[PDB]
Enzyme design. Sequence first.
Site, PDB file in Angstrom:
ATOM      1  N   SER A  46      -0.612  15.651 -11.930  1.00  5.23           N
ATOM      2  CA  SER A  46      -0.884  15.299 -13.320  1.00  5.23           C
ATOM      3  C   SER A  46      -1.090  16.566 -14.155  1.00  5.23           C
ATOM      4  O   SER A  46      -1.625  17.537 -13.628  1.00  5.23           O
ATOM      5  CB  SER A  46      -2.106  14.361 -13.415  1.00  5.23           C
ATOM      6  OG  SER A  46      -2.481  14.118 -14.722  1.00  5.23           O
TER       7      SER A  46
ATOM      8  N   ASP B 257       0.868  -1.184   0.000  1.00  3.75           N
ATOM      9  CA  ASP B 257       0.000   0.000   0.000  1.00  3.75           C
ATOM     10  C   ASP B 257       0.900   1.229   0.000  1.00  3.75           C
ATOM     11  O   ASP B 257       1.401   1.651   1.057  1.00  3.75           O
ATOM     12  CB  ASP B 257      -0.854   0.016   1.247  1.00  3.75           C
ATOM     13  CG  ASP B 257      -1.782   1.205   1.282  1.00  3.75           C
ATOM     14  OD1 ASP B 257      -1.884   1.902   0.268  1.00  3.75           O
ATOM     15  OD2 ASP B 257      -2.398   1.397   2.343  1.00  3.75           O
TER      16      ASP B 257
END
Length: 330
Positions: free
Chosen positions: A199, A35
């Site tokens: 992004s 994770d």
Amino acid sequence: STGSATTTPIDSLDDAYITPVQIGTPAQTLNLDFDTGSSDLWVFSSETTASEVDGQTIYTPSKSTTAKLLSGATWSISYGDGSSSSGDVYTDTVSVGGLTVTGQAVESAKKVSSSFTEDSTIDGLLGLAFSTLNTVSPTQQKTFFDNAKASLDSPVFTADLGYHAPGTYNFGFIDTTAYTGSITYTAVSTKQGFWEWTSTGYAVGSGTFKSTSIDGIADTGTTLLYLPATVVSAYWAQVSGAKSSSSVGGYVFPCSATLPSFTFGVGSARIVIPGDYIDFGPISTGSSSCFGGIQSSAGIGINIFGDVALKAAFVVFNGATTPTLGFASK
Ligand code: NA
């Protein structure tokens, strides 16, 4: 040193991926969920409340000649999905794919929430976010990656998740055979303890690319792609009959649909998520309503590039002094 381990989807939907991990001496092999959005290595154990264990493999520290109680240390964690666990702490030898760390904090669960008990395939979590998020008190502990780092050939790990197929986690090296083209690196902020990046924008299907900054985290422990409501509405508007359902808890779509791709920007590069990756199947067994893999992050307080996005890429988690993320197509 290096390590290389295969990661395997737990079910036919790629709801999560499990990777075998050796703990203790002699080795006890547990299947952990790696994770990148958390920083605790915790396991089902011989200490876990018996009614909260249903088929998981447990770690028994009393059977390990290298286990030692980390006296006074406790831990307690709550995840984004509402699940939680807590317990006490041992140090022991932990190996992943042939890479060994001695003295790793292994957080032994005394209590786990119902979602963990109900998932017989996940024997615990191995956190790979920054160690500043580790919940051990009163002495915070390091992640497996942070303890391995100085021994690694390169201070990196890579995630290569499969679509409906096994993939790979590598530690200490880039496998140049595992991706196509070049790796595009992008800056990381460690301010919130995550692999947080920006992004450069998105496209829906064959549509034009929208240049826009989207801050989010690279999180292998989250199944879906969670993005701002504007982006998500623009995606689902291209699917006839898709709608946001308050009753189901997100966007659903007709199982008869063919889904468009979704592209996200990494600098001047582009990662394309095929439409099929966005299909999470019927909302209930036999339903003709299907659950979408792209969902709104509104109310979560962060955008999450979870497995739907990451499994479209070869992802480099660069833990050099100045961390960075890399993305390549594959
Ligand atoms: Na669900």
